[PDB]
Amino acid sequence: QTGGSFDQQGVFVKGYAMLGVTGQDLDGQDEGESGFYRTTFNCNELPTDECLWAWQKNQDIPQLTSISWSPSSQRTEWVYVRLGYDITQYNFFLDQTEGMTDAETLRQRAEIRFLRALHYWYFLDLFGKAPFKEHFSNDLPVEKKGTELYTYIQNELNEIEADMYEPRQAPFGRADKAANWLLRARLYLNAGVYTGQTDYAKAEEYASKVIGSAYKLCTNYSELFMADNDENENAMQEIILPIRQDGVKTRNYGGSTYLVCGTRVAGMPRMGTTNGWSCIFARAAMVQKFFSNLEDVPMLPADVEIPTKGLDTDEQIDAFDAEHGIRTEDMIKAAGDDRALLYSGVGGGRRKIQTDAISGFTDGLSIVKWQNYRSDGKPVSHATYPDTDIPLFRLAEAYLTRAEAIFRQGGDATGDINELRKRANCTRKVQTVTEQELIDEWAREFYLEGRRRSDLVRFGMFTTNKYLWDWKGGAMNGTSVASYYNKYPIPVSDINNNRNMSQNEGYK
Numbered sequence: 001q002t003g004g005s006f007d008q009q010g011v012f013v014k015g016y017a018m019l020g021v022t023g024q025d026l027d028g029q030d031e032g033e034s035g036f037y038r039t040t041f042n043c044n045e046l047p048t049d050e051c052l053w054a055w056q057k058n059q060d061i062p063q064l065t066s067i068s069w070s071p072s073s074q075r076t077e078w079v080y081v082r083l084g085y086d087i088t089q090y091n092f093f094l095d096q097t098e099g100m101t102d103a104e105t106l107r108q109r110a111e112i113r114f115l116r117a118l119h120y121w122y123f124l125d126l127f128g129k130a131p132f133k134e135h136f137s138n139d140l141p142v143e144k145k146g147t148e149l150y151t152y153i154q155n156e157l158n159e160i161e162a163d164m165y166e167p168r169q170a171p172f173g174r175a176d177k178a179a180n181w182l183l184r185a186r187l188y189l190n191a192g193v194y195t196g197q198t199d200y201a202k203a204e205e206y207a208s209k210v211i212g213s214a215y216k217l218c219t220n221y222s223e224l225f226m227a228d229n230d231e232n233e234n235a236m237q238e239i240i241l242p243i244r245q246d247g248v249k250t251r252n253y254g255g256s257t258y259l260v261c262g263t264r265v266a267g268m269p270r271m272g273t274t275n276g277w278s279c280i281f282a283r284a285a286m287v288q289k290f291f292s293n294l295e296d297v298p299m300l301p302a303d304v305e306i307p308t309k310g311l312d313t314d315e316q317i318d319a320f321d322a323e324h325g326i327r328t329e330d331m332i333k334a335a336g337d338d339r340a341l342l343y344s345g346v347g348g349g350r351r352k353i354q355t356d357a358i359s360g361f362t363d364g365l366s367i368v369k370w371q372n373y374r375s376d377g378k379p380v381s382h383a384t385y386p387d388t389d390i391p392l393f394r395l396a397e398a399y400l401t402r403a404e405a406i407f408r409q410g411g412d413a414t415g416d417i418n419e420l421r422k423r424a425n426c427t428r429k430v431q432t433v434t435e436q437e438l439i440d441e442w443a444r445e446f447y448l449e450g451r452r453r454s455d456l457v458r459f460g461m462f463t464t465n466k467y468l469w470d471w472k473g474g475a476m477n478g479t480s481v482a483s484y485y486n487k488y489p490i491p492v493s494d495i496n497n498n499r500n501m502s503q504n505e506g507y508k
């Protein structure tokens, strides 16, 4: 539908919706697996030191879990096709509005181009290249890779800035200048990876612009991931770009539902939902980001039995956990960090910190960072699907990005790192910053937010022996894998359909 049938406003809104909702066609793929969020999240989380997918029988899960996928990877095709599809939609909107000079359309085009740029970043970060097309048409996309792609995204962002909303002036959910600046800061931070030439001075500069804007850090970390993060100034003042989610109106199995339902199982107190999928749990390496010595991690003694009765309600579960100091609040206290939103209690069965074999959901601690509970205690909209928004872009990213840029430039990054540690009410403060502390802090601050893999690759820790974590590369204590795994392969299906695309080095 074009011309007189083109619903500009409607298509504009759908532009943003692709970030958090699945439409309504790949073979053997549940609709709930096609989302922009879920596919990119898995590609940047499942293979990392942050988490594990409990149901390994699911297609392509073992491959992603241990960094052993191939060009026939179903989950690689999923994110590749999803990213490409969203872009064709943006190109369509831009083509249909081309030539329109009214203030309204200009702003919409700026934001759409912002959204397209973000998508091209994922292509660049995940594949080092992307099936490029500036317009909507029949023509096969051409290949745009590395430096040229990097330069295109940067140029897009630089060109559309002037037309975007001032920081915190756009309707909640839409991207403003600070979102623009944050994306560029991320690009610059990883410029070394994408172009072979680092540019930390620029990453620092754009990070400072974001930090110097109206955005501010939420005083209660957990609130950023709660049901009312779209009706709480404390959380909203930090969320530069949210992915709206609603228990009744905006549902997505791969949306906040994925982060809440996917990390819970029946028996856990305060599930915030009626459905616990028991899918995502933390690896020992994740827990170690909060407990350098895993022996300090509050755990139930192995010689203590868990009653088969009397543990049916949250009240009973909590009381039992308190007796053994294993309530999440007890986990946070022992961790001396508000971000230690983990659970080792008996709700759902005995938990392990590390496992000799990936058997089930309880082989690692549970992650209760995402919640379908409002900080003000008010009712949520639905008993199953969460109202919780996904704060894709948070101000915290600017502090860690500037901190990393300063450190790599030979300066003192303690100031920026302690800004986040202070917010999380950390008992331990950083006296000096090391590469190790930085990558560890990136995990403590952003675990389960869909970016882990990218930070690891930048630190040369994703495939190498520089950092081995439980189950990395398929080995209990971790093992390395080929360096070509730092980039996902181009789906064989697209290699076959578009001769313009060349496979990434290393893959067959």
Ligand SMILES: OC[C@H]1O[C@H](O[C@H]2[C@H](O)[C@@H](O)[C@@H](O[C@H]3[C@H](O)[C@@H](O)[C@@H](O[C@H]4[C@H](O)[C@@H](O)[C@@H](O[C@H]5[C@H](O)[C@@H](O)[C@@H](O[C@H]6[C@H](O)[C@@H](O)[C@@H](O[C@H]7[C@H](O)[C@@H](O)[C@H](O)O[C@@H]7CO)O[C@@H]6CO)O[C@@H]5CO)O[C@@H]4CO)O[C@@H]3CO)O[C@@H]2CO)[C@H](O)[C@@H](O)[C@@H]1O
Pocket (backbone or CB within 6 Å): 030, 031, 032, 033, 055, 058, 253, 276, 277, 278, 279
């Ligand atoms: O008919 C269309 C429908 O088909 C499928 O759903 C039906 C099943 O095919 C059918 O067999 C029956 O499922 C029951 C099983 O038969 C029964 O054995 C038991 O299943 C076990 C399962 O065997 C275990 O592996 C374990 O399951 C895990 C999964 O392995 C995890 O991946 C996770 O799951 C979640 C998905 O990952 C999410 O994407 C989402 O799934 C939704 C799809 O994304 C969406 O497109 C679709 O429309 O709805 C899906 C949900 O209904 O949520 C999933 C969790 O709900 O977590 C589960 C749970 O740990 O444990 C289960 C439970 O013991 O029980 C099964 C359910 O009763 O009935 C199914 C319909 O309810 C497709 O899966 C579905 O997408 C199609 O629409």
Ligand SMILES: [Ca+2]
Pocket (backbone or CB within 6 Å): 231
């Ligand atoms: Ca409300």
Ligand SMILES: [Ca+2]
Pocket (backbone or CB within 6 Å): 227, 230, 244, 245, 246, 387, 388, 389
């Ligand atoms: Ca919401």
